[PDB]
Ligand binder design. Structure first.
Ligand code: CL
Ligand code: CL
Ligand code: KR
Ligand code: KR
Ligand code: KR
Length: 162
């Protein structure tokens, strides 16, 4: 398992514009297009990201291309975030994957806000981090996914994804 397979599991793959769990226009593997209510606007953002008039539908390849870009961007956001980087650097490879998934899902800013779990993680206090992480809107709104990511961070193994 790796970060790509992991997020491909959590986000799925859809070739036509769809709305995510919050109601936002998204396409591919969890690629948000806009927070706006407008399909037209979503469509504009999509053709802009793809480089052609998609009419709201893309190919697998194009979807994987956006995904590659988004993963990369998630890593680079972590590395540039002064509150995120040190946690990330302290972690083993599997746990790092968990942090990349959260950031992909909620953005840098959002995750940087989990001050307390960040610190427990940094301290390698796994069970404690796990309990804190679950006290969040994130967990109450997308509990199945949150649970898989939280077990990943807690245990350092991919068991939740097998
Ligand atoms: Cl883009
Ligand atoms: Cl769920
Ligand atoms: Kr994490
Ligand atoms: Kr976190
Ligand atoms: Kr954790």
């Amino acid at each position: 398992m790796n970060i790509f397979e992991m997020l491909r599991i959590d986000e799925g793959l859809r070739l036509k514009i769809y709305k995510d769990t919050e109601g936002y226009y998204t396409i591919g593997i969890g690629h948000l297009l806009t927070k706006s209510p407008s399909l037209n606007a979503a469509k504009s953002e999509l053709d802009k990201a793809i480089g052609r008039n998609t009419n709201g539908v893309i190919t697998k390849d194009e979807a994987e291309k956006l995904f590659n870009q988004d993963v990369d961007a998630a890593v680079r956001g972590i590395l540039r975030n002064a509150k995120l980087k040190p946690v990330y650097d302290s972690l083993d490879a599997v746990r790092r994957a968990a942090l990349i998934n959260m950031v992909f899902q909620m953005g840098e800013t959002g995750v940087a806000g989990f001050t307390n779990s960040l610190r427990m993680l940094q301290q390698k206090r796994w069970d404690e981090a796990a309990v804190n992480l679950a006290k969040s809107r994130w967990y109450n709104q997308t509990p199945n996914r949150a649970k898989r990511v939280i077990t990943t961070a807690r245990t350092g193994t991919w068991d939740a994804y097998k």
